[PDB]
Amino acid sequence: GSHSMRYFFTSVSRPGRGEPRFIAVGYVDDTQFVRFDSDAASQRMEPRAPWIEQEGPEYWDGETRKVKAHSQTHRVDLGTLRGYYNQSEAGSHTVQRMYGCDVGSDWRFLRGYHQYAYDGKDYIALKEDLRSWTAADMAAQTTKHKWEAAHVAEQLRAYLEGTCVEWLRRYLENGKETLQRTDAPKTHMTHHAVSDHEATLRCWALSFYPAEITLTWQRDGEDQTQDTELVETRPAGDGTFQKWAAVVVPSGQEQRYTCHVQHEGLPKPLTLRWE
C-alpha cells in the first residue's frame, strides 16, 4: 500500500467578527489524526485518532506552537490577498492550504505537495520537482516571485522529503492496527420493484478501509457507466467507508447484470449477481 500524510488548513476572515478562523487537521491515509480550531476553548493541537494520544507533552506542545504560528501567517496572508485584489475590508474570504507527502509500499519518498487556494480557486502551487511554482494569476505571480527570492522551495524539499516522510513512517509504525490494516468490503445487493416492468438492483460495499474502491455494474459484459447511480464514498464514522452502485433492470433481466467490486483488501475482485 502506498501511504500519505497530508495537512489541511482553512482560514476564513469574519469582517467585524474578530480575528479570522483557522481550522487545521492532519491525516494519514484516510485516518484523521489531529486538529486545531481557533474558536476552541483548548487552543491546543488535539488528538483525533487513538494512536497519536500517547505521544507526549513535547509533541502536543510543539504542534500547538507551530499550528498557532500557521494561524498567524494565514491571517497575514488574508490581508495581503485583500491588497493584491484591492478588495473591501467588509468581505469574508477563505484561503486553504494543504501540504503533505506520499510514500510507496517500500515507504520511500514518492511525492511532495503544497498547494494554496483563495476564495475556493487555485492561487499558487509547488510543482512535483519541489523547487518551482504554478502561479494562477498576476497576484499569485507576485507571491511566486517572493518565494523564489527567499528560496522557500529549497526549504520545502527539506520538510516533504525528510521530516514528512520520516514522521509518516513513524505514524505508520505507531498506529499499526489502524494504519497498516486493509479492511476488505462487505458486499451484498438489494432488489426493490420500482414498477410492474422495472426494478432497482443495488450493489453495496460496506465496512472497508482504505476508501479507494471501484464499484461497477455490467449487463452481459457491457459497462453500465451511463446508467449506474453511483454515490460518493461516504464515511461510516468508525473509520471505514461505505459505497453503492444501482441500476434499474427491466424485470426478468436480473441475471444479465453483474456488480464488480475492486478493493486492496480483496484477493481477486468480486463479481456479484442477483440469483
Binding site: 504542534e63 507551530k66 518565494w147 522557500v152 514522521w167
Partner: peptide, 9 residues
C-alpha cells in the same frame, strides 16, 4: 508533525 514555517504570500 507540522512544519515550522512563517512564510506569507
Amino acid at each position: 508533525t507540522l512544519t515550522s514555517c512563517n512564510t506569507s504570500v
